[PDB]
């Protein structure tokens, strides 16, 4: 399914 993009702004 989805990857981190889902926008992981706190990475």
């Amino acid at each position, epitope marked *: *399914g989805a990857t*981190p993009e889902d926008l*992981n702004q706190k990475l």
Partner: antibody, heavy 112, light 108 residues
């Protein structure tokens, strides 16, 4: 790819505290942020905050800063949300979400 | 706060009909939008993510489009199991914000 499992229904007394848990299963816990969202018939859906179990970074909605504490345990792939000083307005369904997957929600009833 | 204006807010539809729901954002959200649906008493189920990716398990009847500020969700032929409330989620910036929801009901 799998799922979020939330703790059961909580009945608390005004002024007390609750800690809700969200277990992440079937996906790498450290690559995705877990976000907590509040739902009530009056206000609809609202974002509380969120945490990156990876980097440990947290972000909060201004309205919940000082009320809610977000934490995550990497050994149990469990994100946690603490709510202090409860009043009846805190009475809601609470949801953890990965933005795509959603936990099933825990009902918190604040009552005497 | 990015504002999400979801319309219409309630729609009276027939089974088998094509439905379109929209969300305008107060600023450009770079396609970071989800589309989910909630049935009475049940938790939210995401349908679409990053504006137009179907979610594993979702009929191809659902399709999402848009870029920048205007996003749409089309349901090609409406089924009984699609009844419920539809929301959009912007996750471009914090705080995350939701649309007011779109309530679907069968006309009669």
């Amino acid at each position: 790819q799998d799922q979020l499992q939330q703790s059961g229904a909580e009945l608390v007394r005004p002024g007390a505290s609750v800690k809700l848990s969200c277990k992440a299963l079937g996906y790498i816990f450290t690559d995705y942020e877990i976000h907590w969202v509040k739902q009530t018939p009056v206000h609809g859906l609202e974002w509380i905050g969120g945490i990156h179990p990876g980097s440990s970074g947290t972000a909060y909605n201004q309205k919940f800063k000082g009320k809610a504490t977000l934490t995550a345990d990497k050994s149990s792939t469990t994100a946690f949300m603490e709510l202090s000083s409860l009043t009846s307005e805190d009475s809601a369904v609470y949801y953890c979400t990965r933005k795509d997957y959603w936990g099933q929600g825990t009902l918190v009833t604040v009552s005497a | 706060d990015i504002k999400m204006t979801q319309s219409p807010s309630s729609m009276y539809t027939s089974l088998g009909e094509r439905v379109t729901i929209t969300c305008k954002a107060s600023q450009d959200i770079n396609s970071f939008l989800t589309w989910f649906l909630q049935k009475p008493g049940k938790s939210p189920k995401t349908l679409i993510y990053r504006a137009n990716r179907l979610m594993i398990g979702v009929p191809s009847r659902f399709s999402g489009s848009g870029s920048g500020q205007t996003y749409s969700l089309t349901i090609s032929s409406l089924e009984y199991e699609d009844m419920g409330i539809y929301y959009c989620l912007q996750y471009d910036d914090f705080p995350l914000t939701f649309g007011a929801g779109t309530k679907l009901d069968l006309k009669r």
